[PDB]
Scaffold this active site. Sequence first.
Site, short mmCIF file in Angstrom:
data_model
loop_
_atom_site.label_atom_id
_atom_site.label_comp_id
_atom_site.label_asym_id
_atom_site.label_seq_id
_atom_site.Cartn_x
_atom_site.Cartn_y
_atom_site.Cartn_z
N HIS A 61 1.28 -0.84 -7.52
CA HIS A 61 2.57 -1.27 -6.98
C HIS A 61 2.61 -1.18 -5.45
CE1 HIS A 61 3.99 -1.30 -11.13
NE2 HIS A 61 3.52 -0.07 -11.27
N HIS A 91 4.01 5.53 1.70
CA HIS A 91 3.58 4.22 1.24
C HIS A 91 4.46 3.19 1.93
CE1 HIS A 91 6.99 5.33 -1.32
NE2 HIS A 91 7.30 4.04 -1.21
N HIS A 93 6.36 -0.95 1.53
CA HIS A 93 6.75 -2.16 0.82
C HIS A 93 6.67 -3.30 1.82
CE1 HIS A 93 8.53 0.40 -2.37
NE2 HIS A 93 8.76 1.20 -1.35
N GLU A 103 12.94 -3.09 2.10
CA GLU A 103 13.88 -2.79 1.03
C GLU A 103 15.30 -2.64 1.55
OE1 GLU A 103 11.84 0.28 -1.41
OE2 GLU A 103 11.40 -1.48 -2.62
N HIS A 116 7.87 4.37 3.82
CA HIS A 116 8.59 5.46 3.15
C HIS A 116 7.73 6.71 3.21
CE1 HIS A 116 11.13 2.46 0.65
NE2 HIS A 116 11.58 2.63 1.88
N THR A 195 13.29 3.72 -5.26
CA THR A 195 13.44 2.26 -5.31
C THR A 195 12.48 1.62 -6.29
OG1 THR A 195 11.85 1.81 -3.57
CG2 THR A 195 14.14 2.26 -2.89
N1 LIG Z 1 10.02 3.80 -2.94
S1 LIG Z 1 10.60 5.36 -2.84
O1 LIG Z 1 12.15 5.31 -3.21
O2 LIG Z 1 10.29 6.00 -1.42
C1 LIG Z 1 9.78 6.38 -4.04
C2 LIG Z 1 9.45 7.66 -3.64
C3 LIG Z 1 8.81 8.50 -4.53
C4 LIG Z 1 8.54 8.05 -5.81
O3 LIG Z 1 7.92 8.91 -6.71
C5 LIG Z 1 8.90 6.76 -6.18
N2 LIG Z 1 8.66 6.23 -7.48
C6 LIG Z 1 7.41 6.36 -8.17
O4 LIG Z 1 6.50 6.95 -7.67
N3 LIG Z 1 7.36 5.73 -9.46
C7 LIG Z 1 6.23 5.77 -10.38
C8 LIG Z 1 5.09 4.87 -9.97
C9 LIG Z 1 3.95 5.67 -9.36
C10 LIG Z 1 2.85 5.98 -10.37
O5 LIG Z 1 1.81 5.08 -10.15
C11 LIG Z 1 9.54 5.92 -5.30
ZN LIG Z 2 9.12 3.16 -1.34
#
Ligand SMILES: NS(=O)(=O)c1ccc(O)c(NC(=O)NCCCCO)c1
Ligand SMILES: [Zn+2]
Length: 257
Positions: A61, A91, A93, A103, A116, A195
């Site tokens: 992702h 990471h 987006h 975002e 982020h 998100t």
């Molecule tokens: N975009 S965010 O709001 O900064 C954000 C910060 C920390 C997170 O843990 C997630 N969500 C997440 O990791 N979901 C599971 C997929 C990873 C496993 O491959 C999103």
């Molecule tokens: Zn993010």
Amino acid sequence: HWGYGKHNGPEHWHKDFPIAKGERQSPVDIDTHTAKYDPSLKPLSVSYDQATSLRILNNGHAFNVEFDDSQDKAVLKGGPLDGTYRLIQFHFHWGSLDGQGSEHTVDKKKYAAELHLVHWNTKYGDFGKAVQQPDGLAVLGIFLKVGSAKPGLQKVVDVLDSIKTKGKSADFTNFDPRGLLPESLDYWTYPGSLTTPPLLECVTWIVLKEPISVSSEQVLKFRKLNFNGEGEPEELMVDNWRPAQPLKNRQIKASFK
Ligand SMILES: NS(=O)(=O)c1ccc(O)c(NC(=O)NCCCCO)c1
Ligand SMILES: [Zn+2]
């Protein structure tokens, strides 16, 4: 499984993650004229001098640069937060085109990408516990616009060839995330969510006013990554952003006028 395509993208997520239609979902549009300056907001305290990066991972992702969060080495405090939050990963987006990718939006403006920096509240002991709490995470969001190169991003850009496909990881030590910060730490803040699924409503969002500039070549290299695993049909990892969600009963506060 969820993703960013036509058949599994953000408009589908609520079928597996009903909180997608919840009361504090992220991202949101930041209407700069409706945000309220809060003079009680404290300056952000970003203490990244002892940061220990470990690895970079394509998770299908985005790509995550992961850090040692077993001690207070890279922490965020101050601002709207109470307590100490430890950096666990960052990471991005980004878009298929320079005109989209962020975002959060600012007066409906979309940036080319959004960084982020994800931190968890140490009073909850680990990240898994923290995401179950309304004040469990603090995510520092930084917009990227296309212009001059960001020198501190280049070590990230150069390793992406090693993690092209889902599930690939590489050693990524001695990366200093201070090289990704803008000059000003002026910020907006509001209560929100992850998100991406599981979309948990555990995040104090802190979104910096000042974007960083990255070069067209830097963001092009993001767009060469793949959502798929090796030996699967190639989908370019682009447009891995969730659009703005309803603000509902929330106020965005600004640390500056
Ligand atoms: N975009 S965010 O709001 O900064 C954000 C910060 C920390 C997170 O843990 C997630 N969500 C997440 O990791 N979901 C599971 C997929 C990873 C496993 O491959 C999103
Ligand atoms: Zn993010």
